Design an enzyme around this catalytic site. Sequence first.
Site: not given
Ligand SMILES: O=c1ccn([C@@H]2O[C@H](CO)[C@@H](O)[C@H]2O)c(=O)[nH]1
Lengths: 440, 440
Positions: B83-86, B123, B171, B186, B190-191
Amino acid sequence: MFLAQEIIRKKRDGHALSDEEIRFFINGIRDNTISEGQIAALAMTIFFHDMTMPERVSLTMAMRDSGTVLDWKSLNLNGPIVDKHSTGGVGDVTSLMLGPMVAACGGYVPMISGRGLGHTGGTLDKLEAIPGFDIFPDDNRFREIIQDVGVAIIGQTSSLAPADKRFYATRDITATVDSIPLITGSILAKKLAEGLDALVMDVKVGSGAFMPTYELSEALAEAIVGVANGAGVRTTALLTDMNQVLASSAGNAVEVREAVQFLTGEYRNPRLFDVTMALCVEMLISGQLAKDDAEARAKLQAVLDNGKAAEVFGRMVAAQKGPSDFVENYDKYLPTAMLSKAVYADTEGFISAMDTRALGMAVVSMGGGRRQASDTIDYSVGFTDMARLGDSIDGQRPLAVIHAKDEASWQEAAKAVKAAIILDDKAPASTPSVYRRITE
Amino acid sequence: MFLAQEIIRKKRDGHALSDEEIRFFINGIRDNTISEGQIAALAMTIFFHDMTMPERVSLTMAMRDSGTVLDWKSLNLNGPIVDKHSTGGVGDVTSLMLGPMVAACGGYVPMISGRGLGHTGGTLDKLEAIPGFDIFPDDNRFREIIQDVGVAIIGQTSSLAPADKRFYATRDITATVDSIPLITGSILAKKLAEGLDALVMDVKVGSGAFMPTYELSEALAEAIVGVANGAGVRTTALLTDMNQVLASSAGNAVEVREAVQFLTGEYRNPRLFDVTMALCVEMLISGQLAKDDAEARAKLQAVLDNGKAAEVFGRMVAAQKGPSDFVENYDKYLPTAMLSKAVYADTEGFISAMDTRALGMAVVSMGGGRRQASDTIDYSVGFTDMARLGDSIDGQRPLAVIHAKDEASWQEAAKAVKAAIILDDKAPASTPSVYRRITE
Ligand SMILES: O=c1ccn([C@@H]2O[C@H](CO)[C@@H](O)[C@H]2O)c(=O)[nH]1
Ligand SMILES: O=c1ccn([C@@H]2O[C@H](CO)[C@@H](O)[C@H]2O)c(=O)[nH]1
């Protein structure tokens, strides 16, 4: 909405908060507008970057201003409003004599106290030993008793620095109790809401102290002094010894008795006198009632000598619903333990050290204080004739006289007492009762 | 009780947590057995003191185990779970082509993607512009889809890293957001809970980036690579460019359209191509499908040009209850904005820079985003035929075509765009699509 977060961000990057912002945040701590997380954040933030003196002052005045502050002008008095604050201690009955001694010399001392949940014996509970005594006069009656007697010792207010309560509570779960500008904040706020012209601070030194180190006690004192003066309240502080019980007794009625007898002249513990005297001197000089120490001690000695101090204590007691002849016949009114017997040591020699906190809990477990917050106080139990560091101990000289409600509580109290006192083949050495005077 | 505060105190004064401690604190968050103030304080204490790699991995692995972690081992799948995360930006539609492209080459891509809050458009939002598209298949449906088509893009469940929920929540109120290991904790959790054999991370750079400065964007990538790889998942991270719209369209339907024309071949944005390809290459190499970059680009360009990738996208839409013929009849299914009308500059020159943040915000204002999750998204609004950094501007060179709900919202969009695109006589330096690659 949250503007608090900006404020947190600001201080987090080591900037200095403004008066306006400092006042915003605590007021929102008061009103629960500002979240708990935000408060924790700010606390941890202040814990890191510390605070400038202007920040310390602003925080202190802002907390002080979160509730009502007593205005003593308009109401006409020719003297200084002055009180004493203290980090507390076993046997520390001083405020019971000190208020009347100063009131006698021209000062008006509105002493407000906090029973709170304090493990430590509070003076408010000491006075409840006196049948009839009311610790909760209303604002108006309080104004009068100050106006005529010159001193009253009263009950706490939610109206006094309410912000500190949520502030302290949060600090207590986030490991931010423990920062000098914050401690200086929670300590000074309530006390400054009395609308003081002057103040003296008693910072305990020693084993039985809030601050475990001389330098640590001295540091707090300096901090408190600097902040208090900065808020337009002429202030000094004294380090005082708490390596043993200060008075010759510990409890409630029993301690009230020591104070009448201190004021009347019937008996003055030399260490307790040293402390008491030192503190009053400060209240007088700061209050602009004495030019120097010599003058203050003369003015002070005299009111102890002509009975005028004891009279003020006596009147005060009456103003507050107590018997009007209490000074003359205190034993007539003071609750008396069912069993009152000397405890003796398992061995001979000299007392080289005492654990004031253990002693303090021995009293509590005797009904002398509150184990649970809902418990009642048995005002009659306590210790008297407390031996002292230095005293030679045989089998003919008691460590103390334990006053208990029954032989079961008496006996445990004796094991606790013997256990909390340490003897040695050779004598320990004298220490002052009063150490350093801190002006700034 | 909690001992949470002793963990806060431990990190304050700069000490390592140890996992047993960290895993315990993460769960209390999820279970709600730890106060908001204690989360804040600990976040804050970390911002100041940062975390070690063993602390970093623990933090993330803990948040990752607080919900469900997916397993595909059962499915006996031939190829790698990739997978990819952006960190996203305006025009970042890469996943819509990337997932079918990688699927087309042997990889399986379970993209579970998260909500559009954080501001800007997601997305999942884009995909729901497709009539019938359903982002919430049940655990088996998701599995047989991935098993049969090789890629699905679905919305997030209650059970995926639920600890981060309140964690990030507090936070974002306490100014403890900008902490790399907190962000790294954070984002990755999830990913990493998707069951990935491999992962590539796209970290945006510039005016439209999450991080302010290049060096921070690098720092985060490095951390993420370190921890992800630490956590057991092969991982690389590309610093890609965001000083302008990546695609040529910004919005939802319009970005879907662009995805389609990108796969089939009607059109490909040169810059959209660079990033999409490089991310897909990582997934191929990280995911054991290409030994080297060139083979990777060769396998990808192949399925881009034999209509394979396009067909995979066709099947994936269909699988999720999109119309089966979407790739061929998208104009028929995607909604048409009521007003489509071009915006020009008020001066000749070259496009010197554009505020991507402002542009994305312009689209949200049109009705293509959510300020508050209560809001309805108008899927047909946005930008197309976007001018780029470098282009020359005269009376017949529009900055973009704007798809607006009405005349009112169009001018408003037109003004934002004008105000967000800056021109100059001087053609500025031409930056690349991909600044750096990171496996190290
Ligand atoms: O620790 C964090 C902080 C923010 N985001 C989300 O990821 C976006 C940027 O990638 C942010 O605007 C927020 O929605 C995260 O996934 N992790
Ligand atoms: O930069 C761009 C953006 C879009 N289009 C094309 O414009 C048409 C929009 O209907 C489609 O052919 C699309 O590929 C371009 O040619 N160039």
